[PDB]
Symmetry: D2
């Protein structure tokens, strides 16, 4: 699992469950090509997005669908989504965890990058 996403809710004090996440990878022509997608579990974690083979060097965008998540809970939030855009694997394969904490009008994200 070289790409994981963990999301917490700062209003409820809970994992953020059933949050949709789409990952895109910048293509040869400079567009955002769909790469992987999935949704957070009961623990707020999203595993199994990709594999070591498929997760090659590139510029990736991890879009966390915070508006969808908040609307589902009956709340009108500010942002459309939270975006995390970064170059990956440019020194060889790393494992990345993108952690996010969500409020209706704010989010924070950080990355944990490990070398297996």
């Amino acid at each position: 699992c070289p790409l994981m996403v963990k999301v917490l809710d700062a209003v409820r004090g809970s994992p953020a469950i059933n949050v949709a996440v789409h990952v895109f990878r910048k293509a040869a022509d400079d567009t955002w090509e769909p790469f992987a997608s999935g949704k957070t579990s009961e623990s707020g974690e999203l595993h199994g997005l990709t594999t070591e083979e498929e997760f090659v060097e590139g510029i990736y965008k991890v879009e966390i669908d915070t508006k969808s998540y908040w609307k589902a809970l009956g709340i009108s939030p500010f942002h459309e989504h939270a975006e995390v855009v970064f170059t990956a694997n440019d020194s060889g394969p790393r494992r990345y965890t993108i952690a996010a904490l969500l409020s209706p009008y704010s989010y924070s994200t950080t990355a944990v990058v490990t070398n297996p």
Copy 2:
């Protein structure tokens, strides 16, 4: 001044000075069209991006060029840029401040929407 951007630096404990910020509006074909841009001041603020008449309802993206900011300070950064994407809705209050706190592997952003 319906739209202001204010950026802080969590490593130096200072405003984030001379950071490029580009704002885009989402066009009818779902592409992002340039809307306004500038560099943050000594106080980490960017005023004067737009006028009331120009800032209509719509989806906007504020891209903050964090990677060049950290490289100019000799610090190795994780992100290509930071992006804040939101709907401007006239039912809400009328003045939008997008605020961001930058670290090399992290950022936080919040909106302050007032009258």
Copy 3:
């Protein structure tokens, strides 16, 4: 104005208005002695806490009464208060802004220390 406090609300997307803030200085016996206090303004800011002559080097605690703030809004909060504890050191720049972003189960704080 060597010391300013600015507080934002991540749930409402607004300044955090009428929040009580107490500042303490650490005494020689390691107890916290009252130093300054006030309530944030409509803009979420608290100016005028102290003067240059009064604000000496030392360890300070800024306690932000978040629990009463969230209860007055009818929201159930996690924390008793938020606390920011730091050393004021004259070798650094001279003006300290403590900024905080509040949520019911979370808060972030950063320092902006400038000349």
Copy 4:
């Protein structure tokens, strides 16, 4: 494990290893009585602070020793520590995770509170 602490470093993109944490509990007389302490592991996590029996109702302060952590890495940070003060177990036993993300001049903390 009803009380856990997880700490990330926003400068390195890593767990924050070997971070000291002291927990205090407000006593009958209104002082802060030492309750438990420990340090984060290689994963940035601190387990085994307390037990279900000992972690009773009360007002707790979790002090994360961020100044010590940064000084050990050769960095002069702003804060003495990060403090998380909250009432616990006042509706019966819950499990709490206090998550923190640290920068030299900033920190963020959130709580995840679960009902076993």
